[PDB]
Amino acid sequence: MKYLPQQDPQVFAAIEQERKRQHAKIELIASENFVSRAVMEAQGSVLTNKYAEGYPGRRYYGGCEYVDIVEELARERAKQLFGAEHANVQPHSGAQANMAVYFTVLEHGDTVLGMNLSHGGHLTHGSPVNFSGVQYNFVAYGVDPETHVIDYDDVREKARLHRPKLIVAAASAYPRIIDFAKFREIADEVGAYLMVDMAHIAGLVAAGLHPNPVPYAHFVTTTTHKTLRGPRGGMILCQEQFAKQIDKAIFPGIQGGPLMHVIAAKAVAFGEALQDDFKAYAKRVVDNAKRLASALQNEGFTLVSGGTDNHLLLVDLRPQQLTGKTAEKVLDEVGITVNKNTIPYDPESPGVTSGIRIGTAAVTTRGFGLEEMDEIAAIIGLVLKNVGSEQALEEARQRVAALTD
Amino acid sequence: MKYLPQQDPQVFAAIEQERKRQHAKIELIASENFVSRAVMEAQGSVLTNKYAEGYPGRRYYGGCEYVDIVEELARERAKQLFGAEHANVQPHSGAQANMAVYFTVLEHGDTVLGMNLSHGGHLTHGSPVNFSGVQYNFVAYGVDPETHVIDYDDVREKARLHRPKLIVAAASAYPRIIDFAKFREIADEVGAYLMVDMAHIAGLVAAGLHPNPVPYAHFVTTTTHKTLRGPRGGMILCQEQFAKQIDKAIFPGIQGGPLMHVIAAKAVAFGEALQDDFKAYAKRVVDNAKRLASALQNEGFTLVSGGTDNHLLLVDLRPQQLTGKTAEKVLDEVGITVNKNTIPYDPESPGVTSGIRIGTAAVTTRGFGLEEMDEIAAIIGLVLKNVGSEQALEEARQRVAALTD
């Protein structure tokens, strides 16, 4: 940076702290990643200056010829990545992407069927303190109490009982492949739309490592910043039949001016995802997660569902008589970043939990491989089996530093 | 830029076109401005990588110590700028800032009283194709048919008749000072909350050139990217009594992860606005608008309300037998960027209009003064009085180029 250090020493010092923090820690928050310098440069461009309400070639402001090129690049590359008939790259976030789909097909008070939030469903899939649960009548399906795999007969029963207008599939903390074909079959049985929120798994889908929801779902929502490794924001994919309605839902429905610089950054990220090396990256993410899962099991940990098919895993800490809150805190002390996370049928509150959620997307981006996964698991074992030993924690600290260099 | 040109030639070429366009044109879109290089660098930082749901010291993710510093800098500087008791710097946009306030105090179907959209009110102040008009029951007050000043007796009558839960003051196309004291008096009479959407005038308020709504309003919303000259995004100000509710409305209510890099950019912009030179800048904006108004009147143009108290003006093109659409198009041909805009009591549709909206914030940022305002008015006169003369348009083109260098 050249101008920020002089203009704003306070902001610059804090940004520098954050940059150094991102290098020093072992980042295992499953929703996080590290964007490329190209993505960041696009976000830091003069495109922030442009009002561009509307869509390419159909804007409500003059002078949009070039931001139109940028938005169309984003849309076309997204369609190439996911094989979708239509893309809307304007959503400000995952929240707004989901909000727009709900606004498109539902009226206030309509019934929606989503994944149980404490089994892996997201805030925007019906929390009573979120617009989703306040605006629409959410009901929930669960995972099997033993296998922790989505119970598709429960999806079906809930759908047949409650008769939702919309069914939502996908999750913030589900470690297995989701069967979109079965969701669509159930949706078809009850005459419901199917929305798939692929936010977490989007990069894996792009790389052919998770089944693609696009051919099965009426609407696919996603963030651009998780396994897709792009800037912070949202996106909607859908068939041409819903294109006009979806676009109108984003604008003039729920947003105003789009963030053209972020949209540029989206285009860049999609371009990166189209490359062969991104496919190799995504395979390493999944390979690393499986290796980490196996290594943690070797350390004596129980995993929700018994492992992972994707980028993330959930440790059930009940065998260790630890809460997720306790584990999160102590791991923070040694430089490992995880989230406390409810496990299916958790006896603890969401503020406490019996689990920790871990993902490999970020560490894989920084070049971690199988050997590093073994060591991460070993350090987690050392820490969680010796929470009261400051010497154990100091050893962990040194081993974490050894990994981040 | 260093990495983008190599990684993504297509995106880079389009960004470069846009950068050059921003230099070449006379930018008179009233909602636009040019951010500093420091603001852009903050947006292009690694802060995009950080999930930070929640608030400073009260986050749902570990490792937020430094993004907390950044967000608190934004909040404290905003409070210093506007004298507000509380700031929420997380809203992704003006849309989301307004959305959150509505979510805080209203239930589905509640009556809200806002400015007539064709008299200057914004999309999010009750358009039937926007969430505001779909979710809540909007009624409207108007300006006087002759003076084009808000009719405060109409505000009062509408309030007493319809009994709104909330009154919204502020506008996207109102060239005069708004009397927030009168709005609060009316709000008090009917037991309604008062929200002021100061998006357009925020920089002028910060500079003491427009009365501050903060002491009169329960909630003040704004964008950060208009006269405030910051990054693209939203903000909410309110008294401490509503702080908790407002914060909960933004998260977990209507958003998820905030854009920490944009929040950094907000802090930077607020820091710039706190400086003496920003006050001088804002005075030049208002001085320039008054000069431009006078100069246009000298060219024979009629202005809505007969001039301006702020950064923007509205030309009533009926005396010239031109539509706003026609004027917008021909000015585009010569390198002057304006919006078609409905005038109060417009006989034309919103797709056609009888007016153009012009603002001086952007041209003032690039260093334009009073002499430049005279020349801009002269060029607009030359163009709009000679729409059928290609030689006149070519002369205009050359004079525009002369201004932008």
Domain ranges of chain A: 1-32+284-405, 33-283
CA distance A7 to A17: 17
Residues 6+ apart with CB under 8 A from A127: A117, A133, B252
Q: Known catalytic residues of A? A: 51, 53, 197, 223, 226, 232
- Taking CA–CA distances from B7, the nearest residue in chain A reads A38
Task: Please tell me which of the candidates A10, A231, A332 has its beta carbon nearest to residue B48.
Answer: A231
How close B40 comes to chain A (CA, Å)?
5
Which residues of chain A are within 8 Å of residue B36 when distances are taken between CB atoms? 3, 7
Residue A379 and residue A362: Cα distance in Å, rounded? 18
Quick count: other Cβ atoms within 10 Å of Cβ B402?
Answer: 10
Contact B64, B263 (CB under 8 A): no
Residue closest to B383 by CA, chosen among B289, B301, B305, B311 = B301
For residue B197, indicate whether it is catalytic.
yes
Are B102 and B109 spatial neighbours (Cβ–Cβ below 8 Å)?
no
Closest chain A residue to B27, measured at CA: A63
Q: Which of B1, B46, B103 to mutate to test the interface with A (most CBs of A within 10 A)?
A: B46
| B69, B397 Cβ separation under 8 angstroms | no
> Cα A197–B100–A131 angle (5° rounding)?
35
* H-helix segments, B252-389: 260-273, 276-298, 324-334, 361-365, 370-384
Contacts of A188 (CB under 8 A, 6+ apart): none
Question: Is-contact A21 B66, C-beta < 8 A?
Answer: yes
Strands B219-223 and B193-197: what pairing?
Answer: parallel
Beta strands in A333-374, from DSSP E residues, in sequence order: 336-337, 339-341, 355-359
B1-32+284-405, CATH topology level? Aspartate Aminotransferase, domain 1 (3.90.1150)
Residues of A in contact with B400 (CB under 8 A): none
Calculate the CA A282 to chain-centre distance: 14
| Residue contact A11–B268, C-beta within 8 A | yes
Per DSSP (E only), the strands in B39-125 are 54-55, 58-59, 86-88, 111-115
Looking at the complex, report in whole angstroms how far the Cα of residue B356 sits from the nearest Cα belonging to chain A. Answer: 12
Structure tokens at B184: 């609060």
Query: Which residue spans within A50-116 are E strands per DSSP?
Result: 54-55, 58-59, 86-88, 111-115
Tokens of B130: 């926007």
Query: CA-CA distance, B62 to A92, in Å (whole number)?
Result: 24
Q: Mark yes or no for CB contact B339/A123 under 8 Å.
A: no
8 A C-beta contact, residue A320 and residue A385: yes
CB B362 within 8 A of CB B356: no
CA–CA distance, A132 with A128 (Å, rounded to integer): 7
Known active-site residue B182 = no
Q: What is the C-alpha separation between A359 and A313, in angstroms, rounded? A: 6
Helix axes A65-82, B9-24, angle to 10 degrees: 160
What is the structure's resolution, reported in angstroms to one decimal?
1.7
Alpha-carbon distances, residue A230 vs A233, A272, A275, A277, B370 (angstroms): 8, 9, 14, 15, 44
Q: What class is the A33-283 domain?
A: alpha beta
| Determination technique used | X-ray
- Most B CBs within 10 A among A225, A232, A278, A357, hence the mutation to make, goes to A232
Contact B131 A103 (CB under 8 A): yes
Say whether A35 and B51 touch across the interface (CB within 8 A).
no
Please tell me the distance from the alpha carbon of residue A190 to that of residue A188, in angstroms, as a whole number: 6
**Which is it for the CA torsion B120, B123, B125, B128, positive or negative?**
positive
